[PDB]
Ligand binder design. Structure first.
Ligand SMILES: Nc1ncnc2c1ncn2[C@@H]1O[C@H](COP(=O)(O)OP(=O)(O)OC[C@H]2O[C@@H](O)[C@H](O)[C@@H]2O)[C@@H](O)[C@H]1OP(=O)(O)O
Lengths: 77, 60, 339
């Protein structure tokens, strides 16, 4: 990943919305983030992952009235 | 006790935040201060990008 | 027409003076104009950065390492950066590197960025708003390029006259006028550093330097091309840059290599962790023209202690109190304890 970023690739052109939601989709399973995301998708009854579920996990996982920018910006809807 | 200096430095923030928002008023007259209340900085965008460039090169 | 451009909000409060010139005027008037009438200090170094302007393909790792090393050398030395006056190419990347590395530092952090270009391209190509001085020179109609090359040769020769001031050349990712400036600056006894593994012409100079070394002549034992690999460098100089008229630039790039002490080729993939300022200092200590105190304080500004112990503090050259005095003051005030 480092070699790709320092030879020919920029994150600005690479990453899109679907690549990011797919990137949160194929998390391996031995992590904390897959139980947290599946617990939040169980609280919303949505079978697919989007950035609003990731944003709510980040908001409850930062605390102190943190507001994640996936919920407020139109680029992550 | 092995981190007593650092935990004093950490709770010093909570002391500063406890007394930063108090009324700017006389110590027997702080309720008069609440009467006179009743009656974190933002920067320029080019200045913010210059902040970001200096912070990123110190990170470098 | 001479004066001072205020670029319309292009980054930076300071304005940049410009001067119309012809090639009939000598360079000594230019030097006494830029040291007295424009109030510039006589520097410890003059770096001349040369490359492509329109056709310019560059790697991100290589551009970051080049701009980091060049900024580090020019800000720890306080050197004049002589480039073209073009808002695209290596001049644009040097200007953006100066822009992100002259904002938000100490107040005494300003690099005198001189641009020697032609009046026949300005409004060819507009001026880069990050340069600090402009020499716009012409004699004929629009499209003439060689008068920039001749002024960049003779003005830096007169810098070397007032040797006194070490002048170095940096070449990466250029075209025919790039290697023309290379030849005309080797003619003016300016040593050159060629970034091998960079682009389309600097790779040709590198592949003619280290792959085709040969000493088979009397008359101070010059270097020329190999007869074995002359066909490969002929195909490379006719295919990689330049379509027609490649014979004059092929004989010219053979005549660049006429002195071994004047050309230096520092690659990327050979040494990454070696900074470009050590390459500049090795070129200046290889040319054997600078004063020992100029080599000494260039080694001071770059914290080069091993090359100073090797080639500046040799046996045959004797030091005293008065020659080491200002260097000692610099080493004390900047915390250079090994020096
Ligand atoms: N000084 C210049 N400023 C802006 N453009 C230049 C300049 N010189 C040539 N070109 C153009 O770019 C095309 C090829 O660009 P390069 O080969 O990458 O430029 P080169 O490396 O030969 O010389 C650039 C100059 O800037 C410095 O690196 C050095 O003084 C050197 O004389 C030419 O057909 C020529 O075609 P055109 O002018 O764009 O029609």
């Amino acid at each position: 990943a480092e070699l790709f970023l320092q030879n020919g690739l920029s994150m600005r052109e690479f990453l899109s919305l679907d690549i990011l939601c797919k990137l949160y989709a194929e998390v391996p399973g031995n992590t904390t983030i897959k139980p947290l995301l599946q617990k939040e998708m169980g609280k919303r009854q949505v079978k697919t992952i989007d950035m609003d579920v990731v944003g709510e996990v980040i908001e409850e996982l930062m605390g102190d009235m943190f507001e994640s920018y996936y919920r407020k910006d139109g680029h992550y809807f | 006790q092995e981190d007593s200096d650092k935990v004093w430095k950490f709770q010093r923030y909570d002391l500063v935040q406890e007394y930063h928002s108090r009324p700017v008023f006389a110590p027997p007259l702080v309720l008069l201060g609440h009467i006179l209340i009743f009656i974190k900085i933002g920067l320029s965008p080019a200045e913010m990008e210059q902040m970001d460039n200096w912070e990123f090169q110190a990170a470098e | 027409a001479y004066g001072e451009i205020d670029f319309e909000g292009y980054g930076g409060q300071k304005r940049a003076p410009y001067l119309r010139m012809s090639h009939d005027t000598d360079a000594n008037l230019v030097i006494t104009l830029m040291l007295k009438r424009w109030n510039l200090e006589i520097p410890n170094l003059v770096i001349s950065v040369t490359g492509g302007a329109k056709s310019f393909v560059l790697k991100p790792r290589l551009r970051e390492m080049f701009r980091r090393g060049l900024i580090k050398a020019a800000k720890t030395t306080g050197a004049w950066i002589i480039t073209g006056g073009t808002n695209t190419g290596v001049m644009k990347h040097v200007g953006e590197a100066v822009k992100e590395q002259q904002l938000m530092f100490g107040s005494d952090t300003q690099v005198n960025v001189i641009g020697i270009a032609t009046w026949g391209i300005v409004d060819g190509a507009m001026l880069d708003p990050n340069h600090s001085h402009f020499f716009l020179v012409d004699d004929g109609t629009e499209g003439k390029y060689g008068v920039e090359i001749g002024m960049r040769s003779r003005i830096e020769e007169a810098i070397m006259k007032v040797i006194g001031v070490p002048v170095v050349l940096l070449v990466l990712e250029g075209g025919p006028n790039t290697v023309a400036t290379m030849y005309e600056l080797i003619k003016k006894k300016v040593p050159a550093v060629v970034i091998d593994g960079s682009g389309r012409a600097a790779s040709v100079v590198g592949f003619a330097y280290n792959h085709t070394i040969k000493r088979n002549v009397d008359g101070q034992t010059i270097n020329v091309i190999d007869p074995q690999y002359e066909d490969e460098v002929r195909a490379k100089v006719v295919e990689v840059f330049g379509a027609k008229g490649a014979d004059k630039t092929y004989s010219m790039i053979k005549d660049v290599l006429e002195d071994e002490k004047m050309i230096s080729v520092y690659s990327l993939d050979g040494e990454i962790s070696q900074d470009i300022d050590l390459a500049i200092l090795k070129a200046l200590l290889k040319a054997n023209r600078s004063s020992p105190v100029a080599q000494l304080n260039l080694a001071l500004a770059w914290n080069r202690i091993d090359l100073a112990k090797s080639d500046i503090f040799t046996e045959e050259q004797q030091w005293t109190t008065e020659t080491l005095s200002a260097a000692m003051l610099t080493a004390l005030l900047d915390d250079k304890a090994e020096f």
